[PDB]
C-alpha cells in the first residue's frame, strides 16, 4: 500500500444510499469498503480548519509544518485507517458520508483515488433522518426546514467538489436511479472505476457475512435496510410528511433539488420517467 | 531512518513553564533537534483521547474495525511524519508542544523508546506570565488569576500523574527554577537520563540561535523574544505582588499541586535557591 494505490471514496449526505452503494461494491470479490470509519471525516475536518485560517497557516508554516508535511502526515494516517480497519483486497474503498466535504483535498493527496457521490432527493434524506432519528451534528431533527437547509448546504459543497475534480475522478450516483436500474448503473460505475464487472454486485444480500463480501456493523443505522435485496420501497416515503410551509418554500430552501434533477414542486417526482 | 521504536524526546508541561527554553537548550546540542512547536500534535492527540474515552464511541469504532491497534498505527504514522519532516534531521529527534504531555502515557505506549521531560514551574509564575503577556489557552480565562491557577492545577495534575505512571526510566521532572539557577547540574543529569553525551553548548544556547544544528525559532511563537537571551534568572518571581490578595488567601485550596511539587503556597516567593 502507498499513496498511488487505487482508492475508492464513497460519500454524500447521510440517508442517501451510501451504505447500499458500499455494500454493492463489497459484494464484488475484489473490492473491500467495510464499515464507516467515523474517524476519517473528523481528521479531515480538523485539517480543513487549519486551512480556513490564514493566521494559523502562518504559524504552521513558521513551525516547518507546511502543506508538504501535513499532506504526508494525512496520507499516512488515512492509509493506515483504510488499509488496516478491514480485510485486504485488490481495490480498497472507504465510505464515510461526510469525507466528501474534503473531496478535492483527498483527490490531491491520492491521485489514483476516484469518488462516488451519492445523491438522493433531499426530501427523502431529510424525512429519513427525522423519522429514524439519525443524528447529525448541526442538523435540528425537530425541523424539516433546518434539515433541508443543512442538506442543501452539505450537498452543494460536495457536488461542487465532485464537478471540480471532473468526470474521470468523480461520478454522481443518483440513489433513485440506482435502485430503479441496478445493472445499468453498476455497469457504468464499475467501468468508471476501471474494475471488471462482477454479477455479485446485483445480489449483494447473498454476500452478507461471507469471505470477500459484505461486513456490516450492528451499530450502524442502515444495517437492517442493507440486508435486503436492492428494492424500490424507499423512493417516496417522505410524501405527505413535510409541513406545508416547507413545501411552499421548497425551491428557496433547497435550490440543489432542481440543480440535481429533482422537481421541488412534485410530490413526488416520477423518478423513473425517461 | 525513522520508525515507532526510534528514541524520541517529548518535552511538555503547562504553557509558560520554560518549555521553549528547555527545547532550545537541547537544540543547542549538535545531535538533537527539537524545533518549533508543531501545534497539530496536541490537537490530534486530544481528538483521539475523546474517541477512546467514550465507552459508546469505542464500541462503534471496534465494530467498524477501527480498533486500538488500527488507531495506534495511524497515530504513530501521523505523528512521525510531523516530528520527522517539520525540522532538520538529527540522530536524536525531539518534539515540544506543551500539552502533548496530556497524552504522556499514551505516547509512551506508541513509542516504547521515547523519553519525556515534564517542565514544572511555580503555577503562580506560569499564570502571571500568561495573563500579563496575554498568551491564550482555550479553557483559561485570562481575566481571572483564580481561574488560571485552577486550570493550571488541573493540567499539571494530569501531566504529573502520567509522568509518575511511566516512572523515572521514562519521564524526568525538570523544575524550571532549579534549571535556571543550576543549569550545568540539571543539563548533565538530563543528558545522562536521555543517554546522550555531554555538550557544553547547552549552557550557551544563545550562541546557537539560527545556526546550523542549532536553535530554529518561529517569529510568531510567544516565547521567542525570551529564548534568544542566555539562560537567566530574570523570570523567577515577576509574579510577586501581581496576584490579587483573595487568590493569595485561597492559594493552597485553588492550587494543591503547588505544595505537591515543592512550592510553598504561602511563600511570596519560595526560596527557589
Amino acid at each position: 500500500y502507498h499513496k498511488d494505490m487505487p482508492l475508492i471514496f464513497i460519500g454524500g449526505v447521510p440517508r442517501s444510499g451510501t451504505t447500499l452503494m458500499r455494500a454493492m461494491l463489497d459484494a464484488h470479490p475484489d473490492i473491500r469498503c467495510g464499515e464507516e470509519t467515523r474517524v476519517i471525516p473528523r481528521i479531515l475536518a480538523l485539517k480543513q480548519m487549519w486551512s480556513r485560517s490564514s493566521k494559523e497557516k502562518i504559524r504552521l508554516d513558521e513551525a516547518g509544518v507546511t502543506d508538504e508535511v501535513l499532506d504526508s502526515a494525512m496520507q499516512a494516517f488515512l492509509l493506515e485507517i483504510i488499509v488496516k480497519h478491514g480485510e485486504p483486497a485488490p481495490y480498497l474503498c472507504n465510505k464515510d458520508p461526510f469525507a466528501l466535504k474534503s473531496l478535492t483535498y483527498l483527490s490531491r493527496l491520492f491521485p489514483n483515488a476516484k469518488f462516488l457521490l451519492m445523491v438522493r432527493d433531499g426530501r427523502a434524506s431529510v424525512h429519513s433522518m427525522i423519522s429514524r432519528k439519525v443524528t447529525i451534528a448541526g442538523f435540528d431533527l425537530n425541523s424539516y426546514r433546518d434539515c433541508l437547509t443543512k442538506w442543501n448546504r452539505a450537498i452543494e459543497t460536495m457536488y461542487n467538489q465532485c464537478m471540480e475534480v471532473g468526470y474521470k475522478k468523480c461520478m454522481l450516483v443518483h440513489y433513485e436511479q440506482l435502485v430503479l436500474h441496478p445493472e445499468r448503473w453498476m455497469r457504468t460505475l464499475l467501468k468508471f472505476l476501471q474494475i471488471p464487472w462482477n454479477h455479485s454486485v446485483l445480489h449483494h444480500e447473498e454476500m452478507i457475512g461471507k469471505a470477500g463480501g459484505v461486513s456490516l456493523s450492528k451499530v450502524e443505522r442502515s444495517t437492517d435496510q442493507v440486508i435486503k435485496p436492492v428494492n424500490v420501497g424507499a423512493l417516496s416515503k417522505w410524501v405527505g410528511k413535510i409541513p406545508p410551509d416547507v413545501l411552499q418554500d421548497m425551491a428557496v430552501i433547497a435550490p440543489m433539488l432542481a440543480k440535481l434533477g429533482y422537481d421541488p414542486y412534485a410530490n413526488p417526482p416520477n423518478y423513473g420517467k425517461p | 531512518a525513522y520508525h515507532k521504536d526510534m528514541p524520541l524526546i517529548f518535552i511538555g508541561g503547562v504553557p509558560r513553564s520554560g518549555t521553549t527554553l528547555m527545547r532550545a537548550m537541547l537544540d543547542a546540542h549538535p545531535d538533537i533537534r527539537c524545533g518549533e512547536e508543531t501545534r497539530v500534535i496536541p490537537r490530534i492527540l486530544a481528538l483521539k483521547q475523546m474517541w477512546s474515552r467514550s465507552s459508546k464511541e469505542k464500541i462503534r469504532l471496534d465494530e467498524a474495525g477501527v480498533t486500538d491497534e488500527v488507531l495506534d498505527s495511524a497515530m504513530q504514522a501521523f505523528l512521525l511524519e510531523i516530528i520527522v519532516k517539520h525540522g532538520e534531521p538529527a540522530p536524536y529527534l525531539c518534539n515540544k508542544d506543551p500539552f502533548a504531555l496530556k497524552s504522556l502515557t499514551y505516547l509512551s505506549r506508541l513509542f516504547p523508546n521515547a523519553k519525556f521531560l515534564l517542565m514544572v514551574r511555580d503555577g503562580r509564575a506560569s499564570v502571571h506570565s500568561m495573563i500579563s503577556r496575554k498568551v491564550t489557552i482555550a479553557g483559561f480565562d485570562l481575566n481571572s488569576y483564580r481561574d488560571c491557577l485552577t486550570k493550571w492545577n488541573r493540567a499539571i495534575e494530569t501531566m504529573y500523574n502520567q509522568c509518575m505512571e511511566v516512572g523515572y526510566k521514562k519521564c524526568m521532572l525538570v523544575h524550571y527554577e532549579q534549571l535556571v539557577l543550576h543549569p550545568e547540574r540539571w543539563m548533565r543529569t538530563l543528558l545522562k537520563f536521555l543517554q546522550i553525551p555531554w555538550n557544553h553548548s547547552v549552557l550557551h544556547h544563545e550562541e546557537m540561535i539560527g545556526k546550523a544544528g542549532g536553535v530554529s525559532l518561529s517569529k510568531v511563537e510567544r516565547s521567542t523574544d525570551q529564548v534568544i537571551k542566555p539562560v537567566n534568572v530574570g523570570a523567577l518571581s515577576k509574579w510577586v505582588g501581581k496576584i490579587p490578595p483573595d487568590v493569595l488567601q485561597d492559594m493552597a485550596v485553588i492550587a494543591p499541586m503547588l505544595a505537591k511539587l515543592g512550592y510553598d503556597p504561602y511563600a511570596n516567593p519560595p526560596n527557589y535557591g
Binding site: 447521510p14 473528523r42 475536518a45 451534528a137 448541526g138 443543512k150 443505522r221 | 475523546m50 467514550s54 459508546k56
Partner: peptide
Amino acid sequence: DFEDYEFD
C-alpha cells in the same frame, strides 16, 4: 457524546 455523523 458522539452523534451518528458530524457536519462542520
